[PDB]
Amino acid sequence: APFTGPILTVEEMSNSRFPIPLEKLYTGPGAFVVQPQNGRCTTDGVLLGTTQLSAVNICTFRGDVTGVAGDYIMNLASQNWNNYDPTEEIPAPLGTPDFVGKIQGMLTQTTREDGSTRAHKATVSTGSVHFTPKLGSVQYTTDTLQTGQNTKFTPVGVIQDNHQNEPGGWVLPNYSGRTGHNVHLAPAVAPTFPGEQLLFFRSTMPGCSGYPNMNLDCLLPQEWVQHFYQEAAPAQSDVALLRFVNPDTGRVLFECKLHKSGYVTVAHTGPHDLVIPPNGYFRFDSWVNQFYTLAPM
């Protein structure tokens, strides 16, 4: 099982931390608590953190709701509408958000075998110490919805209330409110090697109110996560050499290294939103010692 990377342009891929396509590449610094929980999978196919395979289920919630008299609280159900098990060895239900911000979306429901259905705007602060997904409960500050009926929360974007103030992007939430620290987390990440920086995969979370910081950097495209999980190819070395080619010219644009552990680094310093040809895609060339110095970018 040869090791491989998917043949997909950044635009043909999807963000692994919010259900939306990728938009571009960006490498940068240093003073950051960097440990996204979704979009975490070893190059050999071992999913970690709260990462699951579907891009459409990232940041969604299913369950039941009980409205507080004159917000609403949701009793978490399994992604498949089944029972939720606080036991399983994960930081929280797979797909759960891995940063702090007020995610606004829609709550849809269907009043069982009768037919009626209904939906209302709703937001949910992953900062609200009542954001207890691990415990199996989460409350939304709706815009109003029976009890006993399957309520779904479909995510749509983030908001604000000062500027760029929010989203905490790299601010991990507390899956178990007061009750305790997050468990079974995914290793924090950061470029160790000299001068190298992390090569992220950017997208822009739809703003729905205020002046929120809409950037959303993930370390792996969802299909990459899907590919390694499928292929489950062995990591003949710590680092795998990748070349970003241009299908048209047939000329390498630049290189980067995919570390078996699951992240991407680029031999470059300082901020800079990469500029690539829309047809650009990544291609694995070979494994290398963690010492292989990279041709800059």
Side-chain angles (χ1 to χ4, degrees), residues 148-209:
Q149 315 307 68
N150 284 312
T151 301
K152 168 163 182 182
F153 170 80
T154 282
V156 205
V158 297
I159 67 178
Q160 150 92 261
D161 271 292
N162 215 57
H163 300 159
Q164 280 77 285
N165 170 218
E166 321 224 359
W170 307 99
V171 173
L172 276 186
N174 289 132
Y175 309 123
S176 324
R178 305 311 208 180
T179 320
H181 310 311
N182 303 308
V183 250
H184 319 102
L185 285 195
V189 298
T192 66
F193 198 88
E196 281 182 7
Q197 270 189 160
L198 281 175
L199 171 54
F200 313 60
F201 297 84
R202 222 199 196 65
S203 296
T204 293
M205 297 174 272
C208 327
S209 277

Side-chain angles (χ1 to χ4, degrees), residues 214-235:
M214 301 177 281
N215 293 167
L216 186 70
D217 319 297
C218 70
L219 310 163
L220 293 168
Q222 193 50 35
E223 14 290 296
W224 278 33
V225 172
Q226 302 179 305
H227 193 53
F228 303 153
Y229 169 86
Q230 192 67 201
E231 294 291 276

Side-chain angles (χ1 to χ4, degrees), residues 100-103 123-131 138-141:
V100 172
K102 297 181 187 171
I103 293 175
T123 311
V124 57
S125 183
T126 67
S128 181
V129 309
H130 306 217
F131 170 65
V138 162
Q139 51 182 34
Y140 314 85
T141 147

